[PDB]
């Protein structure tokens, strides 16, 4: 028989690059003992802004261009399966999960949170309105910044390197003091990449957590513990890694593009 | 140097900031300071080590569950896709489905003013635009995303289209609904979940080719052919779908020793009305087979000239086994009747 | 108390063990002692933290590679199987293949006196015994294992048999060689590897239906 | 149409229980920062016995009933891709990999080693001749036993628990002083399970490593560092976990058995 002939057309599946990058980022942190958990895309103004030291009428509330929602009979669930109130919106970043988690659990712990977030900016090739971020939070007594620095460093090594290194510059965020923006050393392309933000969890956030916990009847758990959190852009990274040029490409359901990552692993 | 007044002898000091510094209120704000002035680069590198508090133990389960699933699909042959969480209020019409319970106060566009209540409309919509850009002969894909109804829900839908599978050069194809089902059944086979479909009326689904889905013992999602009316309201030919709700339930395996004593084999057919669903059929035969029915399959059926104009035939292969010992024929042709009896006795 | 003589003032001491203790030679042997006498349960629980030396960085790659593969297969539809690494020297004949380069000096049985040079003989052999125990209409499976030729090698073989796929009730089937190829092509499609076959003569393979893989 | 009908008979794959258990054990340790690496099934008497403080004519060489090999032209590779000599055999346990790794690398590190091992005993329902083990090794300055204890504890918690706990009893092994055998608390079935052995790497093993390293031209790397290793029976555990009764069942290529683990994950 002619064996060189084509076989039965069988469907070959693939995975979306974001899922791929997500998975890689996760496997990485998993190795440092972090656990992956998810939050809801539709949040309450309380968890997205209030919980985190973000003010209503001040310049902070003005760094995130939000998508407000309307509609009735929609049930929003709280960390404990309780109904919560607040103006509904689309989570502006993944940070809210920092709170839902801390309310529902006891330190010490390490978590990482992947998630689709939403912002109202105009879509260009390096910026979008629907993108994903990965949040990280480590809380425990004794936690210090050097740990946040170590954490991030292990991430760079794991991604590029060991000829790669980490860059931490001070920046401001309402929910972490000290705040910082961080870049990674890409030995290959030879340039610095601004990856995300991080810092030492703000006292007011721990406060908020316990306060809501007692409101729910739980005892305070975050008095006297410390912690750091960070969050990074996944598309910004997937693009650099898998060599994609247009961030808009991700949500453009074109197969010719999608299939290009079939065998990424 | 920053203009702070520092009183006190130690170890805890009284520090009053200059008034132009509005950002300096807490002790931590003060620390961020020593940091940046000394230089963030001067902070060493370290790694923490501790036993996580107990209530953090299982945490990853759900996430992982979803991923093994996501993974299995791509391996079964489905191309993954990412669709915007938005919805054009108008499609609530175009696709026969209730309206979105959540709307935007600042929509990006009147076509993305609602929040997707279903996942498939988007898949189908992707189908189209692909056809218009590149002309794929066939397509099999899936997507997992958050839909918004009363509560936020994680859904999973898959869409099939094209000639199907078979020999490229060689004429025949094997595709359509029963192909999409084929894969589905395999998927659960791989997940260790017992699935089945039962005909159900679906506004967006061509009837007859419509059906609700029953994961192990349960109703979740649907499966079927895209209602032609919509098929055509869109420059699109025929499409096949299914959309379920996650997480899927799970049956914790109970391992079970298989017996060495050879099984009891059988040839059997059933003649029942042309309308009767395969379902109840298999069901009955099965529920009466007895406790030693190892296997039950269907090798054939046809309407049939040699029988009642309104009835059909059913090729059923049967197997039986007894763990501790071999099955005595006394029990076989006996139980067989146990079935035929209440079979059409019903 | 154990009968040791302990001289010296500290911090490092001169400890001479009793002669009936032959197991006591190094300082560590001495430590195992304080341990068991004090009680292993009295040793606390801890976790280490350190940045691994650089040359340990990529280590997991190969292992992981194999696993993603193993995984993809089961997802494509292959039942995994584990076969003994042994070989019956006799099958070197039964299956037209060269002889095993490694033999046992203490075989468990003259039928497991050599080391598998190929994986498929075993799969096929599994096929048979399954048929004899339960009668599966069709079967598709794979196995990954270490075969032994000049050097130890990690091989992957898959076996298909049966009526094939198609409508159960409906007559037709679609199976045979071109079905096994179908899956193969899909698998690489999924791995992102460009594969093809070219007819090649294989002693254990019916010719015409024989082919080398690229 | 009749939708309740069966679809196209498509093949549903599955995975072997050992692979499953392997994977689970691995994912677990991966989370503590261990890396998975493999060794060869055909080893040299040197790596299997000599390297580890195991004597030729003494009672130690007599705890493992070995499978000796013969045949020529077979090339056995050393940690560095060099040819090594010694009477050939089938690795009696996975421990040899402790050495191949340490010779090829620099501490500090954490590794775990899954592997099919071979022993000459008679096959019953709890004992076999061909089984798998999982080896673990952590070397670094400052490593202590409490770390080995912690390690194992995290394993129990991860498998059963947190209502589960760990049992360490002193035992003897030529390659580790202090030696120990360990059991885990199964809260469910309510019994203690003897899982494997572990201990603090023996000085003579570190010695052997450096000695062979210099023989190969490499500088000594294990002077002044410490370490613990352990190794456990995988079938013994898979059986308890997936509820299997006969260890012989694993190598019995029966489908009816194999398929029973299709959806284990
Ligand atoms: N429009 C957009 N499109 C795509 N990626 C975007 C984006 N806007 C921001 N990003 C990416 O998403 C990341 C997070 O957004 P950004 O607003 O900068 O940080 C927001 C916080 N979630 C990060 C943080 C967490 C914890 C402690 C401190 C900081 C950025 O680093 C950026 O790389
Ligand atoms: N014949 C057999 N069949 C199946 N499992 C067996 C077996 N013989 C032993 N095992 C399992 O395999 C495990 C290892 O075998 P054993 O000879 O006890 O230890 C041998 C060392 N490789 C373990 C060790 C490593 C590092 C430091 C200290 C000890 C045992 O705990 C047992 O559960
Ligand atoms: Mg400040
Ligand atoms: Mg001793």
């Amino acid at each position: 028989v002619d064996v060189s002939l084509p076989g039965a057309s069988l469907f070959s599946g693939g995975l979306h690059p974001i899922t791929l990058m997500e998975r890689e980022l996760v496997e990485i942190f998993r190795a440092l003992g972090y656990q992956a958990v998810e939050g809801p895309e539709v949040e309450s103004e309380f968890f997205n802004f209030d919980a985190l030291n973000i003010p209503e009428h001040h310049p902070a509330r003005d760094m995130w261009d939000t998508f407000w929602l309307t509609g009735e009979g929609f049930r929003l669930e709280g960390p404990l399966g309780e109904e919560v109130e607040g103006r509904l919106l689309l989570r502006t970043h993944t940070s809210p999960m920092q709170v839902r988690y801390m309310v529902a659990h006891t330190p010490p712990f390490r978590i990482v949170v992947p998630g689709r977030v939403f912002r109202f900016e105009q879509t260009d090739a390096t910026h979008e309105a629907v993108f994903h971020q990965l949040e990280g939070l480590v809380v425990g007594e004794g936690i210090a910044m050097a740990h946040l620095k170590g954490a991030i460093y292990e991430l760079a090594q794991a991604l590029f390197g060991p000829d790669s290194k980490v860059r931490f510059q001070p920046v401001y965020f309402p929910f972490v003091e000290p705040g910082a923006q961080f870049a990674v050393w890409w030995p290959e392309g030879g340039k610095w990449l601004e990856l995300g933000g991080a810092g030492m969890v703000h006292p007011k956030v721990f406060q908020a957590v316990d306060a809501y916990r007692e409101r729910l009847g739980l005892p305070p758990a975050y008095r006297g513990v410390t912690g750091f959190a960070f969050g990074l852009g996944v598309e910004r990274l997937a693009m650099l890694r898998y060599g994609i040029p247009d961030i808009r490409y991700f949500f453009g359901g074109r197969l010719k593009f999608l299939e290009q990552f079939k065998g990424v692993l | 140097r920053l203009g702070c007044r520092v009183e006190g002898e130690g170890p805890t000091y009284r520090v009053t900031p200059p008034s132009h510094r509005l950002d300096l209120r807490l002790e931590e704000d003060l620390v961020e300071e020593v940091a940046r002035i000394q230089g963030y680069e001067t902070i060493p590198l370290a790694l923490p080590a501790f036993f996580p508090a107990p209530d953090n133990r299982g945490v990853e389960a759900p996430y992982r569950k979803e991923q093994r699933l996501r993974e299995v699909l791509s391996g079964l042959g489905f191309q993954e896709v990412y669709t915007y969480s938005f919805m054009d209020p108008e499609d609530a019409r175009r696709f026969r489905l209730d309206p979105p319970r959540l709307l935007l106060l600042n929509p990006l566009a009147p076509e993305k003013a609602a929040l997707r209540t279903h996942l498939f409309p988007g898949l189908v919509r992707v189908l189209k635009e692909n056809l218009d850009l590149d002309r794929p002969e066939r397509a099999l894909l899936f997507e997992v995303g958050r839909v918004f109804r009363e509560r936020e829900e994680t859904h999973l839908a898959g869409l099939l289209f094209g000639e199907g599978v078979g020999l490229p050069w060689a004429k025949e194809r094997l595709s359509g609904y029963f192909l999409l089902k084929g894969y589905l059944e395999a998927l659960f086979a791989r997940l260790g979940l017992a699935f089945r479909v039962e005909a159900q009326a679906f506004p967006f689904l061509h009837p007859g080719v419509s059906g609700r889905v029953l994961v192990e013992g349960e109703e979740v999602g649907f499966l079927g052919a895209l209602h032609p009316e919509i098929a055509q309201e869109l420059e699109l030919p025929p499409v096949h779908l299914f959309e379920l709700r996650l997480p899927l339930p799970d049956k914790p395996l109970a391992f079970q020793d298989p017996s060495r004593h050879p099984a009891a084999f059988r040839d059997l057919a059933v003649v029942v009305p042309a309308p009767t669903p395969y379902g109840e059929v298999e069901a009955l035969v099965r529920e009466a087979a007895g406790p030693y029915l190892e296997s039950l399959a269907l090798f054939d059926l046809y309407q049939g000239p040699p029988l009642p104009e309104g009835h059909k035939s059913l090729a059923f292969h049967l197997r039986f086994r007894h763990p501790k010992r071999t099955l005595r024929d006394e029990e076989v042709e006996e139980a067989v009747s146990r079935v035929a009896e209440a079979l059409r006795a019903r």
Side-chain angles (χ1 to χ4, degrees), chain A, chain B:
Chain A
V1 352
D2 190 2
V3 291
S4 62
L5 275 184
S9 36
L10 252 39
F11 281 111
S12 50
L15 283 168
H16 188 102
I18 276 290
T19 301
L20 278 155
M21 182 84 254
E22 165 156 303
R23 179 172 81 187
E24 169 159 20
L25 272 153
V26 175
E27 261 310 339
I28 291 203
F29 283 105
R30 220 169 220 144
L32 299 90
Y34 286 69
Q35 293 210 249
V37 265
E38 297 198 283
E41 323 208 304
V42 169
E43 199 58 84
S44 144
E45 179 182 12
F46 173 56
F47 285 124
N48 208 95
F49 301 112
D50 301 346
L52 315 165
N53 202 217
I54 299 155
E56 164 52 52
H57 301 139
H58 250 276
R61 173 86 37 141
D62 317 38
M63 320 171 161
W64 286 271
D65 320 80
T66 90
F67 272 104
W68 299 100
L69 279 9
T70 39
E72 228 86 65
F74 178 92
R75 265 154 268 122
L76 180 69
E77 206 137 12
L80 296 178
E82 80 270 13
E83 236 85 309
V84 44
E85 333 265 326
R87 281 206 278 159
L88 287 208
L89 78 200
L90 288 178
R91 63 158 164 215
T92 229
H93 46 189
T94 39
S95 305
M97 200 42 178
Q98 241 158 89
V99 187
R100 316 178 136 280
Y101 194 88
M102 275 191 277
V103 155
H105 299 87
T106 327
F109 66 82
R110 287 186 207 74
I111 49 147
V112 80
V113 184
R116 164 133 85 204
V117 303
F118 315 94
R119 241 167 247 183
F120 203 99
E121 37 203 319
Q122 289 175 309
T123 50
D124 73 81
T126 107
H127 295 100
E128 173 147 352
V130 192
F131 55 105
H132 306 71
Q133 282 179 350
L134 173 89
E135 200 95 1
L137 171 72
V138 177
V139 176
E141 158 182 354
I143 304 291
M145 250 209 133
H147 294 312
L148 150 65
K149 257 191 125 169
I152 284 330
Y153 167 98
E154 269 304 312
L155 167 55
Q157 292 288 309
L159 277 185
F160 332 98
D163 273 303
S164 101
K165 27 183 137 190
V166 308
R167 226 230 313 226
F168 279 89
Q169 259 171 262
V171 78
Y172 162 78
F173 285 95
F175 31 112
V176 299
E177 260 273 310
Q181 110 206 334
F182 60 79
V184 81
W185 187 230
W186 179 31
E188 309 259 308
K191 59 181 135 255
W192 271 121
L193 328 171
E194 295 293 356
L195 253 14
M200 292 316 268
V201 173
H202 195 117
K204 293 249 262 298
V205 181
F206 276 137
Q207 254 117 256
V209 179
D210 282 333
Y212 186 81
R213 272 170 71 96
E214 98 121 75
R215 164 121 89 109
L216 284 187
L218 288 343
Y222 301 79
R223 212 135 299 194
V225 305
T226 296
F228 67 73
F230 62 71
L232 70 245
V234 173
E235 279 96 341
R236 293 287 192 69
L237 179 73
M239 288 192 300
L240 200 143
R241 178 142 242 54
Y242 308 148
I244 298 118
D246 200 11
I247 189 159
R248 297 123 104 194
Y249 261 127
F250 291 112
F251 272 116
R254 159 117 125 171
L255 275 263
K256 279 21 86 164
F257 166 79
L258 284 189
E259 288 145 356
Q260 268 232 72
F261 308 77
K262 228 92 138 6
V264 149
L265 265 346
Chain B
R1 270 217 144 216
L2 278 175
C4 280
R5 206 212 306 165
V6 191
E7 278 135 348
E9 221 34 302
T12 151
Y13 297 85
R14 322 195 52 248
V15 181
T16 318
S19 68
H20 58 267
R21 282 311 283 272
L22 334 184
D23 65 305
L24 299 193
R25 294 292 108 114
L26 315 188
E27 182 184 29
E28 294 65 37
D29 289 324
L30 252 37
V31 172
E32 146 149 297
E33 302 301 289
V34 171
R36 51 189 287 248
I37 293 309
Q38 282 291 55
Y40 276 15
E41 85 279 4
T42 74
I43 284 144
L45 261 63
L47 295 182
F50 59 71
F51 300 89
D55 37 287
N56 302 287
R57 266 346 144 146
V59 161
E60 264 192 326
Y63 183 67
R64 286 207 172 246
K65 174 56 230 115
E66 204 170 273
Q67 296 316 124
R68 260 309 95 103
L69 166 46
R70 217 104 94 115
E71 256 145 37
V72 194
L73 301 156
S74 52
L76 199 46
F78 299 69
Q79 184 55 45
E80 156 142 65
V81 202
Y82 273 21
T83 267
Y84 274 87
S85 271
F86 290 134
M87 153 169 294
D88 178 341
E90 250 317 275
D91 293 77
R93 260 199 252 242
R94 284 201 219 52
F95 306 72
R96 289 94 222 243
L97 20 123
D98 296 23
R101 196 178 269 79
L102 293 196
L103 297 310
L104 282 61
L105 288 189
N106 38 359
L108 260 191
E111 308 100 324
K112 24 232 327 214
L115 292 193
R116 43 136 99 123
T117 56
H118 280 93
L119 248 35
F120 80 77
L123 280 190
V124 195
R125 260 272 162 63
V126 172
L127 174 22
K128 178 210 220 71
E129 17 131 293
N130 256 262
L131 300 168
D132 313 340
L133 243 171
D134 325 312
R135 305 173 62 120
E137 183 186 67
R138 77 238 200 99
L140 175 61
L141 72 220
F142 76 125
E143 154 156 0
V144 182
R146 232 137 263 194
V147 296
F148 315 83
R149 324 195 148 189
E150 354 223 300
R151 281 187 186 284
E152 193 163 323
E153 259 175 343
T154 302
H155 272 208
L156 161 64
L159 161 178
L160 160 69
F161 139 93
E163 306 346 276
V165 304
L167 285 173
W169 37 272
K171 62 279 309 308
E172 319 193 20
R173 258 48 198 334
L174 102 55
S175 77
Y177 168 102
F178 273 113
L179 167 65
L180 198 124
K181 193 191 222 240
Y183 271 84
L184 257 351
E185 313 192 273
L187 156 76
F188 291 81
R190 180 65 178 82
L191 299 176
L193 307 164
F195 130 116
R196 70 190 183 225
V197 318
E198 309 187 336
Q200 184 98 336
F202 279 109
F204 33 62
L205 253 40
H206 164 340
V209 218
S210 226
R212 92 186 100 131
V213 194
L214 292 310
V215 73
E216 130 152 355
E218 275 284 68
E219 140 124 85
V220 22
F222 63 83
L223 150 71
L226 171 54
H227 177 174
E229 211 148 6
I230 306 121
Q232 123 220 308
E233 145 129 24
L234 273 330
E235 60 175 310
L236 258 51
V239 192
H240 289 294
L241 292 12
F242 84 74
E243 179 152 332
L244 312 291
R245 182 198 2 190
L246 317 148
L248 296 194
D250 205 316
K251 148 189 81 187
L253 141 137
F255 170 62
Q256 350 196 243
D257 287 300
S259 13
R260 27 157 225 203
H261 315 83
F265 283 43
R266 302 287 136 118
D267 62 85
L268 188 165
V270 199
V271 245
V272 108
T276 304
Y278 176 139
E280 281 174 326
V281 192
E282 205 275 5
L284 228 175
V285 206
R286 164 146 241 121
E287 209 234 326
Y292 307 178
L293 168 73
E294 177 192 280
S295 281
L296 194 182
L298 160 99
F299 45 132
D300 181 75
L301 79 70
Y302 73 140
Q303 250 330 88
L307 69 149
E309 267 129 59
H311 294 55
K312 355 187 230 198
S313 77
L314 282 195
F316 271 25
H317 257 143
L318 276 89
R319 244 138 119 162
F320 291 81
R321 206 175 213 119
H322 198 169
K324 296 240 181 124
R325 51 87 180 178
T326 280
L327 287 187
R328 147 54 40 209
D329 281 345
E330 277 331 270
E331 312 156 75
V332 312
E333 310 98 29
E334 175 259 296
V336 75
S337 79
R338 303 313 56 180
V339 168
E341 127 156 294
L343 183 40
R344 216 165 277 88
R346 201 231 23 125

